[PDB]
Amino acid sequence: MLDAERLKHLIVTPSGCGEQNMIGMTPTVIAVHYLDETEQWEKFGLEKRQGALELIKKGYTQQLAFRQPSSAFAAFVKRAPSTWLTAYVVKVFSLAVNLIAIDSQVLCGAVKWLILEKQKPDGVFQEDAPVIHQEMIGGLRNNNEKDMALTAFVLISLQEAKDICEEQVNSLPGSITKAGDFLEANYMNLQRSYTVAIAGYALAQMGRLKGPLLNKFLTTAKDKNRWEDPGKQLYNVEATSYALLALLQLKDFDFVPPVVRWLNEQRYYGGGYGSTQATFMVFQALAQYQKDAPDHQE
Amino acid sequence: MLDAERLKHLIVTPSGCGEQNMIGMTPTVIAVHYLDETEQWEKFGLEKRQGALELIKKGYTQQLAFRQPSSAFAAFVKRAPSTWLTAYVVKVFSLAVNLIAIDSQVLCGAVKWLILEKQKPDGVFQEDAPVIHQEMIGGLRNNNEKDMALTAFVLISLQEAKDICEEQVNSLPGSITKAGDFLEANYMNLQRSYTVAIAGYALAQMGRLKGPLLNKFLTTAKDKNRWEDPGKQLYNVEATSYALLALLQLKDFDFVPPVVRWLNEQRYYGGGYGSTQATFMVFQALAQYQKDAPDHQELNL
Ligand SMILES: [Cl-]
Ligand SMILES: [Cl-]
Ligand SMILES: [Cl-]
Ligand SMILES: [Cl-]
């Protein structure tokens, strides 16, 4: 468990425009999420949650300034909308629904736009206006397997929004199936551990990670405890976090304890430059472990 | 004179939204302005000037994304417009008109909006939506003489746009007089050296810094060479630069050399967090000095 005494820096006041505001909202949202699930507010300071929640609501409200009439998001309203940023807003707001009031028309409008404007006939999600802060997208910044990585990223956002939006967005179940088809068709050709992990989570959420795909997912780990590529450590933390979430979806609780151990032994507590995806994902994944299998420990 | 070899950190790529983009635009605009006047492009490398102009045009074009329909500016289009930021864009664009193409409808639309929407019936300019980046407004930040300091700041911007805009904005001369009236009526009650300096320049531009007001302006200086809020180095560089511009308007060349010398002795070359106003003002003021006293004697530091 990441001790609350080491997480004070994650309580951040969001500011800036469409991208930077989300860079600021990210650590506060996910710190509250993780401190909640690990029952660490007595140590952190019980009275401090109210203020954190006010900062999350400020982040949410400020983000609406960058909601374009299409319901998509960009750094500023005169900039063409970003597929990735819109999917990231969906990912954050969906997780934050039990913390603050999230307008379902914002969330589901963003989902519908992604599907109707940015999914292609083969199921891929396409980015036409990349975020300026490329450091906020984690391992997706790498040029290789970008189609697969982004399609998995967006698909994960649709899945995390499905319960809220499935009655409001006609196109949602078919979009999920199409994206799933694309990932499944190309999974065995993947070479990056990062893509194996993020696409693995997306497929496992649909019950479509099995057979030789599931074997590729599991055997891609090094020392059965991490998904790693030659490159930035932060990308490996992010990848292993997506893999932990896929293991939990799979209920592979035997495999989980070494992965959790490796994540704790990285002594990574979020925050800093280029930390957005690693921070969201490591605390999302460890919170989900605490919720689902804290009894499985090394 | 600030040596061109010391200035290359002022050529920067502007980025971000309506406030940050101007934080980036400021050093490069004023660096080119200063290098032009002091004819230092040899030491710097004359091949570099075209690239700097392209960086200025990029800042200009990017800034237009944050021009709201009213012609006012804020950090983002859905934010309530800022009186200060709109006046600062007018200030920067007015000085950049000789470097790149500045659309006069953009510039004078902002001027007209300031007068029609943000000047009160007693001539004060009011800020209803302060900038998020309070570090970019210099010594106006936490300045308790708020109406005097902001009215002086906006008036100064109106004056630097007057030649371009008075033909398109027929309310500009009256707005200038009313702002000046407000400053002159309350100048003697000022206490902050910063406000004395910036309102001093605004009045001097109009020929209305005289008599006891002129005496207060001059005797507020310390050691006859600076306008000082103790411990506030960047504020003081900015304020003393406004004071130098005021002295040059007064043509008080007996007073000017020690002020120029103090500014040079700070070994301050702009740039860095919170440096926007100090950077714009010191290079504006020292360029005007070079322009007004072109054959002054070499500074022996
Ligand atoms: Cl941004
Ligand atoms: Cl609470
Ligand atoms: Cl905007
Ligand atoms: Cl900004």
Author numbering:
A (entry chain B): 1 to 298
B (entry chain A): 1 to 301
What does the study report here?
Activation of the central complement component C3 (~1 mg mL-1) to C3a and C3b by classical/lectin (C4bC2a) or alternative (C3bBb) pathway C3 convertases plays an essential role in the generation of complement-mediated defence mechanisms against invading microbial pathogens. While the circulating C3a anaphylatoxin is involved in inducing inflammatory immune responses, C3b (reported normal plasma concentration: ~210 ng mL-1 but levels are markedly higher on infection and under certain disease conditions although its short half-life (< 2 min) makes accurate measurements difficult) facilitates opsonophagocytosis and clearance of immune complexes through thioester-mediated opsonisation of primary amine- or hydroxyl-containing antigenic and self surfaces. During activation in the fluid phase, the majority of C3 molecules do not covalently attach to surface-exposed hydroxyl- or amine-nucleophiles but instead the highly reactive Cys–Gln thioester moiety within the thioester-containing C3d domain (TED) of C3 undergoes hydrolysis resulting in the generation of C3(H2O) and formation of the C3(H2O)Bb alternative pathway (AP) C3 convertase. Of the C3b generated by these fluid phase or surface-associated convertases, only approximately 10% is deposited onto reactive surfaces, leaving the remaining 90% to react with water wherein exposure of the cysteine free sulfhydryl can lead to dimerisation of C3b and its subsequent breakdown products iC3b and C3d(g).
A crystal structure of wild-type human C3d, harbouring a cysteine at position 17/1010 (C3d numbering/intact pre-pro C3 numbering) (C3d17C), was obtained at 2.0 Å resolution. The structure clearly shows the formation of a dimer mediated by partial disulphide linkage of the thioester cysteine residues at position 17/1010 in both monomeric chains. This indicates the disulphide bond linking the two C3d monomers can occur in a partially disconnected state which is consistent with results from size exclusion chromatography experiments suggesting C3d17C exists in a an almost equivalent monomer-dimer ratio in solution. Importantly, this dimer retains the ability of C3d to bind SCR domains 1-2 of CR2, the αMI integrin domain of CR3 and SCR domains 19-20 of FH. Staphylococcus aureus immune evasion proteins such as Efb-C, Ecb/Ehp and Sbi-IV are also predicted to bind the C3d17C dimer without any hindrance as the concave surfaces of both monomers are exposed and accessible.
